Design a protein around this ligand. Structure first.
Ligand SMILES: [Mg+2]
Ligand SMILES: [Mg+2]
Lengths: 273, 268
């Protein structure tokens, strides 16, 4: 198969590949998996496939997230159209075990608008300055659904949501479980560091607050650096496969009210360390 | 001609269009001009042209910046990987540019533009009120001059004193308001008024915090387009309404571009 990188940092298009064939061809699937680990996000055009095949392909990466939600083919979630996805985020990092990744297919949509972007948070970590790496090495931070999705709810619904999903603490520097690469693991869901206030970092109060929040802002803003980014334009039956552990994504909301239909299959991830 | 926008905010590809022909077809150039003003930046593939044709097309927008083929500058291969409006540090920054890729690597080196008219219009009302009369300085000393020997930096500053420009710029051909601060902008010159400043921290870091919020608007993906170069691909953009960013994701390699810059006037 042909692998065509979109940028030097992240993303590649797979050509001459029918995702349906990877369900039963173990060699083809192995290569796709190898490419996903190297390029963080893989793109394909003209994937005329069935929902069972979409589900069965994603299942090759691991068990699928099967919370009922708002989407006939278990594992598949329909997304028919919200200003929450237009933010640099790693999917559901507010969970104890955020997902491994996702296989996303565009069913129908407008001819222009609605691009999706990804950022390489392995590169974002690797290029940090030495004194930032030393400073953040043992930091941990909390990721909150309360303060993002719950923020606009009636206070009782917000607090119930929080009880259902307590703010998850994760290492700020995450070790990718399959490659060993270090990942800068704070994003739009991250509210604050939990273990910043130490004698090594804090002489006086203003070192802790706003100091801790200023460092967090610097870290989450690394995803906004174009050097780490790729931007993908959707067409009918286009597919994105991405490694949610190593990336953040941003669904661009440049379009007026319109009908866009996507279908995704999320893959279960493990505890970040 | 076929105009294919790349995003809902900015950028469009022109198809079935040869720029060389636009020198003499007045109707065609009018359309190209109209589309540029509407879409901020225009992209074309497979522009097999000579340097004479490149310059003559660009002169249709106005006189060329002339700091073998006058007006054209060859660029053969870390300041351009920043959100900036070209030469906003000048008293009269350029109108725009016609940029052609000669040859280059198959991956890497994308260029991005941001729509700073949209960046202004979506600001919150209280920010629009606060910045309406602001002016700010754009410095070559503090960017290009910064790493030079101190003597060369000051001489460079002497040639181009830090230019003051309105923070809210009126586009001269569309009447649109443009958020006109970028990476070259150092600080506001007229922020410290009794309406904005009660106590010292309101002015400093207060003024600097507002400037950072403004220049950071260019980093919003909603306002952006990203272009991947091919041989003989061409970009034309309105430098008054946009900022651009040359992505520097590539390892050391050889890339060859040619550009024709168009003189702009005083921002007001
Ligand atoms: Mg998402
Ligand atoms: Mg430039």
């Amino acid at each position: 198969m042909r692998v065509e990188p979109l940028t030097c940092a992240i993303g590649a298009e797979l050509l001459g590949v029918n995702l349906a064939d990877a369900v039963h061809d173990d060699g083809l699937f192995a290569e796709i998996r190898t490419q996903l680990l190297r390029h963080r996000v893989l793109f394909l055009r003209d994937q005329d496939i069935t929902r069972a095949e979409h589900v069965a392909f994603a299942r090759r990466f691991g068990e699928l997230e099967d919370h009922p939600v708002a989407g006939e083919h278990p594992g598949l979630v329909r997304i028919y159209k919200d200003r929450y996805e237009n933010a640099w985020h790693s999917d559901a990092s507010w969970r104890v075990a955020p997902p491994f990744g996702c296989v996303l297919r565009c069913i129908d949509g407008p001819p222009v608008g609605g691009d999706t972007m990804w950022a390489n948070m392995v590169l974002a970590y690797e290029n940090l300055p030495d004194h930032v790496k030393q400073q953040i090495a043992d930091l941990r931070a909390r990721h909150s659904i309360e303060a993002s999705f719950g923020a606009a709810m009636p206070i009782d619904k917000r607090l119930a949501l929080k009880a259902q999903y307590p703010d998850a603490e994760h290492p700020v520097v995450r070790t990718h479980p399959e490659t060993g690469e270090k990942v800068l693991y704070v994003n739009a869901f991250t509210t604050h560091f939990t273990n910043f206030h130490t004698p090594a970092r804090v002489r006086v109060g203003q070192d802790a607050n706003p100091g801790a929040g200023q460092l967090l802002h610097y870290l989450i803003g690394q995803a906004a650096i174009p050097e780490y980014q790729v931007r993908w334009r959707w067409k009918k039956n286009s597919v994105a496969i991405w490694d949610n552990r190593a990336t953040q994504h941003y669904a661009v909301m440049d379009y007026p009210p319109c009908v866009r239909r996507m279908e995704r299959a999320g893959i279960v991830g493990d505890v970040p360390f």
